Amino acid sequence: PESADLRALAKHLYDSYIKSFPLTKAKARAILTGKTTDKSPFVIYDMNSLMMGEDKIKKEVAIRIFQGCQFRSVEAVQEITEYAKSIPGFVNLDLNDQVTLLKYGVHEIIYTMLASLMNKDGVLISEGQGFMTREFLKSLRKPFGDFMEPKFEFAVKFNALELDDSDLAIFIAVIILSGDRPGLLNVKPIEDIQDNLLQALELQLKLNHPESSQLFAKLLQKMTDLRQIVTEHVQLLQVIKKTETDMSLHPLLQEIYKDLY
Amino acid sequence: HKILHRLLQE
Ligand SMILES: *c1ccc([N+](=O)[O-])cc1C(=O)N=C
């Protein structure tokens, strides 16, 4: 009936999601489990490992890490913007709203997606070719040692919900289309789309996890956690942007962070 | 938001 239109939207978004993102939760788990046919990731547990590992990857250690982390985020933003464009109705909006939606959305989605890549112990990197340990990241000097830790904490809770790439494809769409971001010119059409996306997300959770109930409600509670986690992060960038003049922030990243929370 | 516009515009 209507459940058809929503089933369609969910498949369109999954398709778009898979085209747009190189490393899915599917392969990432396979790699993390190790139950895969590919060569294991080069573990990075200390400065020695890091230096040996430098060859298998795309200035003091901590600041080097942060610049890689920077390079990668920018690629994330491109993958996310490409995806946003494939959300039915997204590109019909005011271009200034598109920018605002993304400006506020991207860090929420990075963290959602980082979590596909994380476990209690550490995080995959360079498209599953590295595995940088959580112990190693904590160990970095202030402020850098507290930079990734809030994201591991979030990840352990979020990964519990045992979501699928197909669930995430819609879940990230719903995030992008948040009609309650600072400075939108025309909220109604955004909210229109989000209601569709939220119905499709609800259907998808009933269908894909018919044994689990309230995954939908659990999942919407997490959407509020992120905004906080993202604020905590933007704050940290201010701290880093000030106490280090040795580093330069990437132009695209500046765009996002300037006049943001 | 120069680059964002560009990215979106593409
Ligand atoms: C790493 C380094 C810098 C930033 N940033 O300034 O937005 C983000 C990240 C990150 O966690 N990337 C995966």
- CB-side neighbour CA atoms (13 Å) of A50: 15
Structural gaps in chain A: residues followed by a C–N separation over 2.5 Å: 58
Closest CA to A100 of A81, A119, A87: A81
Cα A126 to ligand 1 centre (Å): 14
Whether chain B has a CB inside 8 Å of the CB on A115: the answer is no
How is the beta sheet containing A42-44 ordered, strand by strand? A42-44, A130-133, A122-125
Residue A186, helix vs strand vs coil: coil
Question: Which residue of B lies nearest to A75 if distances are taken between CA atoms?
Answer: B7
Q: Is the dihedral of CA A205, A207, A119, A43 positive or negative?
A: negative
Name the residue among A19, A169, A77 with its Cα closest to residue B8. A77
Q: Name the residue of A69, A72, A148, A229 to mutate for ligand 1: max ligand atoms within 8 A of Cβ.
A: A69
Pocket (CB within 6 angstroms of ligand 1):
A 66, 69-70, 72-73, 110, 114, 237, 253
8 A C-beta contact, residue A97 and residue A175: no
- Which of A202, A145, A174 lies closest to A83 in space, CA to CA? A174
Phi-psi region of A128 (alpha: psi -120 to 50; beta: other; left: phi over 0): left
Domains recognised in chain A with CATH numbers: 1-261 (1.10.565.10)
Burial class (CB in 10 A: 0-12, 13-18, 19+), A137: buried
Burial A202-215 (b: 16+ CB within 10 A, else e): bbbbeeebeeeeeb
Residues of B in contact with A78 (CB under 8 A): 7
Given CB atoms, is A160 within the 8 Å cutoff of chain B? no
Cβ distance B4 to A78 less than 8 Å, yes or no, reads no
CA distance A255 to chain B (A): 6
Which residue CA neighbors atom 6 of ligand 1 most closely? Answer: A70
Using a CB-CB cut-off of 8 Å, the residues of chain A touching B6 are none
Cα–Cα distance between A228 and A225 in angstroms, integer? 5
Contacts of residue A188, defined as CB under 8 A and 6 or more positions apart, other chains included, come to A179
